[PDB]
Design a protein around this ligand. Structure first.
Ligand SMILES: Nc1ncnc2c1ncn2[C@@H]1O[C@H](COP(=O)(O)O)[C@@H](O)[C@H]1OP(=O)(O)O
Length: 134
């Protein structure tokens, strides 16, 4: 459940965009604050919001994880990433979750939609979901 105070685009940036992320255990705290249980896995794309918006404006394709949607877009280049892996599953409380940091590099596929009235008018079309990385 995305917290109502944030638009889909804002929650996407909070969960998946970070050029220079801190350790996973630290970065994930803000995200787990709004959940019932700690997130098992989360990926941060080391790029800028502006760059993802550009990927939105390219060739459209069916979303791999949900082919009924023809609103996905694949990046042209592989981008560095930071995978955050949960260490204590079901174990420790949602207050003391620790993560392992794991670097990676690949293409990403995002679903994009029309901006929310609360979003910046500068970007008519914005990224709202990370479908997968290849
Ligand atoms: N509207 C949506 N469309 C597609 N995937 C979604 C949507 N809402 C949540 N998800 C994805 O479902 C999974 C489980 O959601 P949750 O843990 O909140 O229940 C996550 O990978 C999440 O993506 P995301 O990682 O961006 O949150």
């Amino acid at each position: 459940m995305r917290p109502p105070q944030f638009t889909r685009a804002q929650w996407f940036a909070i969960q998946h965009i970070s050029l220079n992320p801190p350790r996973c255990t630290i970065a994930m705290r803000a995200i787990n604050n709004y959940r019932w249980r700690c997130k098992n896995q989360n990926t941060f794309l080391r790029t800028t919001f502006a760059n993802v918006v550009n990927v939105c404006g390219n060739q459209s394709i069916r979303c791999p994880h949900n082919r009924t949607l023809n609103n996905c877009h694949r990046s042209r280049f592989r981008v560095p990433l930071l995978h955050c892996d949960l260490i204590n599953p079901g174990a420790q409380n949602i207050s003391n979750c620790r993560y392992a940091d794991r670097p990676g590099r690949r293409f990403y596929v995002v679903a994009c939609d029309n901006r929310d009235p609360r979003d910046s008018p500068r970007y008519p079309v914005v990224p709202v979901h990370l479908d997968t990385t290849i």
